[model samples]
Target chain A: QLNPESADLRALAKHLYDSYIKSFPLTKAKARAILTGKTTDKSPFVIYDMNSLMMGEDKIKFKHITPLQEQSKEVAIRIFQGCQFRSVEAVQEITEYAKSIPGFVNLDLNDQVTLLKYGVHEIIYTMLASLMNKDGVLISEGQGFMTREFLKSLRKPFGDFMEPKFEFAVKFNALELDDSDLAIFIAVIILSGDRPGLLNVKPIEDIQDNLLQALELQLKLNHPESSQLFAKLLQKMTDLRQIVTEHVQLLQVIKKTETDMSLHPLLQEIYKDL
Target chain B: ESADLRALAKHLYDSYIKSFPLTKAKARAILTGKTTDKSPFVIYDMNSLMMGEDKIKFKHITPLQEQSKEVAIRIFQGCQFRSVEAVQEITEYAKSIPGFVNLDLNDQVTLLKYGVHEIIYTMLASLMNKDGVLISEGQGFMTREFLKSLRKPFGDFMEPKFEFAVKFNALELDDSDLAIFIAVIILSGDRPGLLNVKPIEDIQDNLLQALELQLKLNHPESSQLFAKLLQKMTDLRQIVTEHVQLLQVIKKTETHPLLQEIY
Candidate 1:
């Protein structure tokens, strides 16, 4: 049985906070750039508030996602390529973060890889919340923001991938989770023992239980008034799995059709599972 | 409190996994129609294929009339064997639930006796989809049509189990959800002969919370899924009652030792 207030659980939460939150991949300026709030009147261009875009006052400028050959597709290509590079960076952040979760390194090494393989995307999407709001997710370390409408206007199959990520982001961003909550949230996703082919399900499952207990307790401490927040946050993990499944399916199609572009080997290695 | 519940939840899931026959991968393969093994399978009652002179009628034996008796017998035998094996696993799984063995002894027996059918139908989801249940170690498939074609009581006895399995599978519950759910089925406080109801109620209440939280974690998208599963427990009781009525008629024509003892 778990003891939510046990010294170890409290300590585990703090350890996660120290390990994951402290090392989470966002600079102070970038973190401030993406914080959800109203924009100033002086100049809309500098701040580029996603919250302002979400207010629906200004009509959005839609950019179509295209095959790499076209000339005017440069911004879309730049954005897509930038996101790709950032995703490779995020995977490294996730791998290191997963290793720091207590008991992760104790898992059978293959099990460790399996958890990371399936779980990295979900963790990335969750961390994406730091740089997201209802309008869209931030790209290139909060310097560029892609709107929900722009993601929606992609080529038919590509739209399929972009749309689901934003939909999940919008709902997840509503939770307004801070880094401490995400420290354990990331651990919860990584340590999920139920992923296909896990050899040490029992220990991994036990670890997840401990992490979830810490996670629930942490959420209660952080979001005291939202009774269902813990449950809602857990549910988003399930949503993230579904989104990742579709994400891979779309990537498979892209691999065949979009020959002009290249995927980072790290991204390819993680996506190799499907 | 939730920590204790989650531990119970973990124990229940582990027991279900250890006791249940098929692995999740195989169950998924069977459900998705991906199993490629074409090994031959005899219906459960291979003995029924033979007929005595006294049992044979002199009328023209149309294929439907001729095959009907053996088909019904096979399916009846199938249910008996399946239920017996399930009850054995259910008994073990029930014993593993933290508070199950701590109840008044008779209350435990009474609970299993009254609740076994519902639990079996719940496990039936693993081998079934809307179309049929895989039988004979995945070598045989029993369609709803085949079960529905039997004589009234035999057809009636199996049709509802298939229906329940179909609906249960539709819930897409993974093992963790099914594990606690089956425990909930076995530990109900409202079973007819329960004694020391308060402790039983307390345990069931804890598990109910555990189950609710488990569903929240596992099936967060379907907000009403926990409520729907509770409704399903009620529906299962109705089904088992109907099953017993049909089994009573079925007893006059056929028999199985374990089925007779339990029902």
Candidate 2:
């Protein structure tokens, strides 16, 4: 499908890109609300909404993430596991998205895995920030904002570990990137790779480069008030990396520091390379 | 296409070399390795200079009070401020960014105040790898271990620099590409207090086009090196800000008399 000579990849990229954004819990309108430090759930069906199906959806039913201290260890572990599970699901979508680009799937399996390990979390964090308002992120469409305070209060151990990420989210929210910006940015993140393991590094790099340039061009057209906005958005990439590093550190600490050693098996493996 | 890469690379670099009239000798000292030069910014293998994971050992001295202040300032001496000569040398290469002479005189001065070190550390990172950057262009390989060994703030600054470099290096940009990148950075327009922004932004856009052309002709397989390099400049801003933050940290904690002139 990525026949480079006969066709432009951006068409296909945009097709897939729009669908990918549509799959998320937050809509572009909701994501934009982060600009004013607040958001509302007007959509009927939302991701992580605490149910797979609903009778006639009127509005998103927000799930309140309870305090980890108040919750049972089983519930706490389940919540963390769910976060990982949902993140991994997005990984498959992203990995598939990258593969749809010509050269990505051609990489060695181990090399592909390596890229996914580091790149997926980065991808997840970028998207995760979208659902967030200054107060907290929406877990379900109706009205589910797990207050920033609740995130910290629940799982007191994890809360302390995640504070930096929350802070990072607030700063990112200030950027107020809409889905269009994120679509290009997400492409950049998914294609971001240069680990030593990949033999066909040039091909992958080429595709990723194409996407970055596309994003910059879009920035010029999509945003007119600030010419410097492109530069500011790129800085967020590093900021994103810093937060992902912290998130993973929290994961590692959870793995070892916990008396009962348990983490989602997939995350356990992903943690090794990270 | 390949034919001009050398001239293109040398054009910007030579212009830069021309500006550092004071440090040509220091550059010589660094390149020759035989100068027996006693400057604060002496070269050391990265391995020899590295430190362990623990930070948080100092006081107001800087934001990162976790490490030894004396040790931190001492290391700073080795990297650039080896001596007063080195301090003037901060603008050593920054003074030469293309269009520098054309920027109405006061504007030139304003740019230098903010941009001098920004370029230096950025180019320093370009010359460096995660492992190390060359000294005397070859006589030495200053490893990251050395950068790591500095006091927390000094050491903290190096990680992001090298981190950006590692990804940038993946582009396998030649000297010409690096030189072009340098031009883009200088004319970046983000420089605070720019009396006029258009001249710089115009230059930046043209430089990007020139870089895109070179990357296309020389590296047809990979055209995005342009975006990655530009993106790295954004990354560089973060690190420079980190550096500025520490400078503020030092000014506030200006407790040490011995290191008063060190920064």
Candidate 3:
């Protein structure tokens, strides 16, 4: 009933696989195994093969049975070591496995780096979302690799080092809130740079309060050292808020000023959709 | 034809304010319709008050009498004073001038209030531009007593005080026009509080440069507005320069044997 020769079923499976890879490429090998109904006894591992995938690799190798099992072992090893080394090892092992997989033959250095960046973004985004929702308890397993890459990005950006330092893993964990709240938090962290961690432990409500308080203080103190920073933050938030507020305000003004007119048939249809 | 003549007459009046001796009596007679001849001084006063000699052009009607009061008060408060007694002395001298005494009692009171308002505005704007604290604290009975005395008059005029607070709040939060006005006041330091007095020429040059920088950074879209603002500032600078020269000439004329011995 479910022959591979059936074009419809083949197309369906391919669609499912493509969607799965796009959404959860860090867990690609495990996803493929689950889709194909494969049975294996080996421990799980997350496959991070950004370079190979972009270079048109068609198949992935599964030396291990499931990604979850592999990730669990990596996590347990990390907790025992009381260091991030095991998580680093997990990333290196997955990368090597991806390179050796059947269709990943000849990716150049640049392509490989691009692919690695993709994998890095995917893995971190997933880990952050999972941590926020408390759905993925595999934090200890992924923390090491996430932390390493975050530090590397910071150093590349030439950020200041004197402020309260946070491992990338923990910062990523903090980003798992609602989207708008996360945007505000990320913006503050980015703008604050080295001083980010000074307010990192603040609860979301407290963070909002602190930013407003900082604005009021800057107004009163008029201190050159901090006033510009506070003004920039206020301007950015105002711009963001204005995008939504002004749209509604403009619509209201238009309605008040203009008289209604009959719509063309086509336009009337469009109004139904609206 | 009438509009063009009115415009030309207004221009001539403005030129006369700089060139001729414009006394308070001459200004009042022209404003109050007691004089039939359109003296250049009267025409200039009317134009500055936003009134065309023939017919009103703009829809927004400003009260000319009130604006004159504002200008007169601003000029008085711009003076350097040793104390409130000196302020009162100067006010009395101003009041003794023939034309000043001709103004209605309400107008005179309005002028005084306007002077006080401008003084407060200039002080606050200077502090803001200097990045100085809005409020300073001194913990002592002497300080408390001094502040209490200052607070008494402020409490009596609660309306102006409230209005001033609102204006200051709006200005501090980057309301562009108000900010630019404050920038002009601070940069000029005409009233004198904290800012160092650069030479007038240097100040004008720096003001233009600072305006250009502000245009690039803040009001890029409204470049025309900035241009207009710069023009107004240049006009004000020219007026002030001419006034100082006139005052010197007046002093010289006053000491002349004919006028001095007769007085």
Candidate 4:
């Protein structure tokens, strides 16, 4: 038996628990209501992409009868621009969070970049579950609920990008993982050994393996009633990887053809090797 | 450390899927031979296998006592072949154990060699009843009486397993428990001729901790279940040691390659 008093074991566990609590941007108490679907915030705002907020133009309300010509490249580019901008900031938060994981900063700088370059989207998607429900995702910091149908209304490619994420978030949120679980899980993603061009695989694997053990221990305590929670989470990791792959492929298409708008520079770097 | 542990648990769960793919009802069906769907297993009687027949013939053959030790040797060889298959699954499962593959390759083989018999027996609980044991992946059933009817050591080899399974089933272990239990048995540091003991012991301890924690959660009412289960691991050592001695007798008469190496 793992000596319950094993200082290293307990410390390792506490580090993950603490790092997760420390890294999350919101107060746990505020996130608690939204995480548990107990949010009382009833304010409704039109779903605006990061670009739309920049353009300072109000989007038309949902209408099935809107003409394709009228809807046009104007709406699509703004929406893409908005999400990309927010994604850049999320990547910043994730980078800081990744650095907080033990052994992460000790890695060769290039390997660190390689891991984050490939793994950031997975971490982002996992955290996105918090801002979502079955039919929609919270936008504008929970001020706006972007319906799945409304995102789909943005037309092909742009609309298609969100359906998978919303679907993943909807199901992922059902696991009811709070910030603590997400913290360790995001670390697990970042330190994944399978990331391409890793120069120091062994150390990264060692770090990942330890984190996994802690996650299991934590899950046993927090989710004892859900016997399959651990396995389900691993499967979701695989799903996240797939979603990120699709997102990259779609992003590539936009990069080649959508000459009217540019993706954020931070995103261009993240997507460079993908 | 926590991330490592979580990763380990996830890897084990992945291995559990590959190693024990049967669902609860399906595993039960393998044990009981009751199912609505096309059962993936068939029942082969040991007596039929001993007689060089795939099925029990309606025509009466000579009584069991009249059969020579030669007939029993064939039965032993048949069972040994099935064990080789079981060993393959165990090997795959071992590779996925959290720290298992990182061990020196020699030590890995040593652990598998010493541990395979116990793992095979522990897994037998999935396909055993008080009356008999399942073989050939649930396609064969060898009754206790029939095995005992065999001449000498071949008869002795399996009875202890039946005894182990009888009490093991009493724990009412589900597949997950069985998975971790098999892991605990495989990562044993006590195996002889080990070049590296510390790493093996460390991995074993982690597995033990995981198993003990799981049992407490899975069987909360049975307070001493973890201790009892550890004793069961100890009990398996004796069963395997004696089985090896019996295999020594068969080793002279038979020449199965896997039995030669593992023994």
DockQ winner: 2
DockQ numbers for every candidate?
A: 0.05, 0.22, 0.02, 0.02
Error (Å) of candidate 3 at residue B97 is 41
In TM-score terms, candidate 2 sits at: 0.60
Q: Which is the better candidate, 1 or 3, if ranked by lDDT?
A: 1
Q: Write the per-residue lDDT of candidate 1 for residues A52-122, one digit (tens) a residue.
A: 43332233332422224344344444446646776777788788888888888988999999998888888
Q: What is the TM-score ranking, best to worst?
A: 2, 1, 4, 3
Candidate 4 local lDDT, residue B138: 42
Residue-level lDDT tens digits of model 3 in A1-274: 4444343323432332343334333342333233233655322232223332222112333233222232333322222222223334434543553343222224344434333332322233323333221121222322212222222233211222101122222333332222222222222222221111222222322333333333333332333443223322332222222232333343344335433312234222212322
Pairs with steric clashes in candidate 3: A44-A66, A44-A69, A44-A70, A45-A67
Global lDDT of each candidate: 0.67, 0.58, 0.30, 0.67
Docking class of 1: incorrect
CAPRI class of candidate 2: incorrect
Kindly report the root-mean-square deviation of model 4 from the true structure over all alpha carbons.
Answer: 19.7
Q: What TM-score would each prediction reach against the true structure? A: 0.52, 0.60, 0.17, 0.48
Categorize the docking of model 4. incorrect
Across residues B28-122, which tens digit of lDDT does each residue of candidate 3 receive?
34434554553322112323323331232212222223332433222222222212433453355334322334554554444443343333333
Judged by whole-model lDDT over C-alpha atoms, candidate 2 comes out at 0.58
Per residue, candidate 1 scores C-alpha lDDT tens digits across B1-263 of 77877787888888888887775457777655566654323223333223311133211221223233555664465456556777888888889887889888999899988888887767666777666666655555556665565665765566777767766666788888888888777776557767788787677667777988899888777644664466456446656666767767766773333334553
Give native contacts recovered, as a fraction, per prediction.
0.00, 0.31, 0.00, 0.00
